[PDB]
Write a protein that holds these residues in place. Sequence first.
Motif, PDB file in Angstrom:
ATOM      1  N   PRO A 197     -19.452 116.269  28.318  1.00 38.58           N
ATOM      2  CA  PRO A 197     -20.720 117.004  28.243  1.00 38.58           C
ATOM      3  C   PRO A 197     -20.592 118.470  27.806  1.00 38.58           C
ATOM      4  O   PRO A 197     -21.242 118.862  26.835  1.00 38.58           O
ATOM      5  N   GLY A 198     -19.774 119.260  28.501  1.00 37.67           N
ATOM      6  CA  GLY A 198     -19.739 120.697  28.281  1.00 37.67           C
ATOM      7  C   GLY A 198     -18.414 121.319  27.872  1.00 37.67           C
ATOM      8  O   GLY A 198     -18.379 122.139  26.954  1.00 37.67           O
ATOM      9  N   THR A 199     -17.331 120.951  28.554  1.00 33.24           N
ATOM     10  CA  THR A 199     -16.013 121.540  28.288  1.00 33.24           C
ATOM     11  C   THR A 199     -14.855 120.653  28.784  1.00 33.24           C
ATOM     12  O   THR A 199     -14.909 120.116  29.892  1.00 33.24           O
ATOM     13  N   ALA A 200     -13.818 120.500  27.957  1.00 34.87           N
ATOM     14  CA  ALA A 200     -12.638 119.704  28.315  1.00 34.87           C
ATOM     15  C   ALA A 200     -11.355 120.221  27.651  1.00 34.87           C
ATOM     16  O   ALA A 200     -11.398 121.123  26.815  1.00 34.87           O
ATOM     17  N   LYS A 201     -10.216 119.640  28.026  1.00 32.09           N
ATOM     18  CA  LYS A 201      -8.920 120.061  27.491  1.00 32.09           C
ATOM     19  C   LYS A 201      -8.417 119.143  26.374  1.00 32.09           C
ATOM     20  O   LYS A 201      -9.209 118.548  25.643  1.00 32.09           O
ATOM     21  N   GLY A 202      -7.097 119.035  26.247  1.00 34.14           N
ATOM     22  CA  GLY A 202      -6.491 118.247  25.186  1.00 34.14           C
ATOM     23  C   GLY A 202      -5.726 117.031  25.676  1.00 34.14           C
ATOM     24  O   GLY A 202      -4.983 117.113  26.655  1.00 34.14           O
ATOM     25  N   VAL A 203      -5.913 115.910  24.979  1.00 35.11           N
ATOM     26  CA  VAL A 203      -5.278 114.627  25.304  1.00 35.11           C
ATOM     27  C   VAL A 203      -5.762 114.041  26.634  1.00 35.11           C
ATOM     28  O   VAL A 203      -5.622 114.663  27.686  1.00 35.11           O
ATOM     29  N   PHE A 204      -6.322 112.834  26.576  1.00 33.91           N
ATOM     30  CA  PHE A 204      -6.930 112.210  27.752  1.00 33.91           C
ATOM     31  C   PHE A 204      -6.088 111.111  28.419  1.00 33.91           C
ATOM     32  O   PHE A 204      -5.721 111.240  29.587  1.00 33.91           O
ATOM     33  N   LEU A 205      -5.791 110.036  27.690  1.00 27.61           N
ATOM     34  CA  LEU A 205      -4.993 108.930  28.238  1.00 27.61           C
ATOM     35  C   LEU A 205      -3.491 109.253  28.286  1.00 27.61           C
ATOM     36  O   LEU A 205      -2.917 109.723  27.302  1.00 27.61           O
ATOM     37  N   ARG A 206      -2.861 108.990  29.431  1.00 24.06           N
ATOM     38  CA  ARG A 206      -1.444 109.311  29.633  1.00 24.06           C
ATOM     39  C   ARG A 206      -0.601 108.077  29.995  1.00 24.06           C
ATOM     40  O   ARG A 206       0.481 107.874  29.441  1.00 24.06           O
ATOM     41  N   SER A 207      -1.104 107.266  30.925  1.00 22.13           N
ATOM     42  CA  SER A 207      -0.452 106.015  31.328  1.00 22.13           C
ATOM     43  C   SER A 207      -1.432 105.153  32.129  1.00 22.13           C
ATOM     44  O   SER A 207      -2.638 105.206  31.882  1.00 22.13           O
ATOM     45  N   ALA A 208      -0.915 104.371  33.078  1.00 24.63           N
ATOM     46  CA  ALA A 208      -1.749 103.554  33.974  1.00 24.63           C
ATOM     47  C   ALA A 208      -0.943 102.922  35.116  1.00 24.63           C
ATOM     48  O   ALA A 208       0.259 102.705  34.980  1.00 24.63           O
ATOM     49  N   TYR A 209      -1.614 102.624  36.231  1.00 25.83           N
ATOM     50  CA  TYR A 209      -0.978 101.989  37.396  1.00 25.83           C
ATOM     51  C   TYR A 209      -1.869 100.899  38.018  1.00 25.83           C
ATOM     52  O   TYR A 209      -2.904 100.551  37.450  1.00 25.83           O
ATOM     53  N   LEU A 210      -1.471 100.361  39.175  1.00 26.91           N
ATOM     54  CA  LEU A 210      -2.182  99.224  39.787  1.00 26.91           C
ATOM     55  C   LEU A 210      -2.411  99.313  41.308  1.00 26.91           C
ATOM     56  O   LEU A 210      -2.043 100.301  41.948  1.00 26.91           O
ATOM     57  N   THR A 211      -3.005  98.252  41.864  1.00 27.02           N
ATOM     58  CA  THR A 211      -3.422  98.191  43.272  1.00 27.02           C
ATOM     59  C   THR A 211      -3.933  96.791  43.669  1.00 27.02           C
ATOM     60  O   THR A 211      -4.729  96.192  42.945  1.00 27.02           O
TER      61      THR A 211
END
Length: 224
Positions: A197-211
């Motif tokens: 919407p208003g403001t964000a940084k750089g690079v979003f997806l990094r990895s993933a885990y479970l449960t």
Amino acid sequence: KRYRALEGKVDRNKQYSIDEAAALVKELATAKFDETVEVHFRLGIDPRKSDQNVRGTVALPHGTGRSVRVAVITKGENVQAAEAAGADVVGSDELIERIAGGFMDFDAVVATPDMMAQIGQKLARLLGPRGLLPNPKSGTVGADVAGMVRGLKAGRIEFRNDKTGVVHAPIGKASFESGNLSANYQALISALEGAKPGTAKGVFLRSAYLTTTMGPSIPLALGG
RNA sequence: UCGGGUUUCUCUGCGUAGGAUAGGUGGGAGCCUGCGAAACUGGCCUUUUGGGGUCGGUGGAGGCAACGGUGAAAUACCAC
């Protein structure tokens, strides 16, 4: 404990992407009844400002093992178009007494165009600040309580944000297939990585885990 | 000794109501005998308001969450 023959096959240093984890998610759950395995993401952009909370919804693919939750408030030719289908708790104008008497576990409480004032003159003193009301831009407004409440039929809604750095939306259940645990996983990176919407940084997806109800976690890979 | 990082191990989180700090989602009703729940005395950690661990007298071993209470969520059983 009970940590082997399900974690012995688990190593937190390799990968298991889209077409691979789907054939190894219903496995890592040799515990009790039906066992669903979470799908973890990490919203750690900036977790302490008002314009970084994902105030939107997600729509699940097929039909889960659940149902449909919508407590309609209508009158006229909208009662036979809302009781002969399968919503939730439908009658007449007395649905202000069913949502101010002692039970508010209902979901998207719908209304009628000229009867929006029923959830604006009588339930703006209690149901007002709940963020679960029908308005002319969001969920269900107008005489569309039969077509786009099907977004509350074929798709588990859910809208939440936190104060730490963990966000995990469910796929539904694993009572399907190894091409449907990655078909429900084609609507989570397809309706959750669109909050800007208003403001964000750089690079979003990094990895993933479970449960699960006895874990574990094989770090999910990413790509095309 | 200091500068910090990473990793194994270690836990605080009462502006609101809610008996007793729920820290989050899913399996939201089950198993647990294989990894820090009860509060009599001059307490450290949250600070001599109530509250996990206590150093030792003092000495019911099976349970809890919940319907209720309850809120956009609930106090436990399994993990991130």
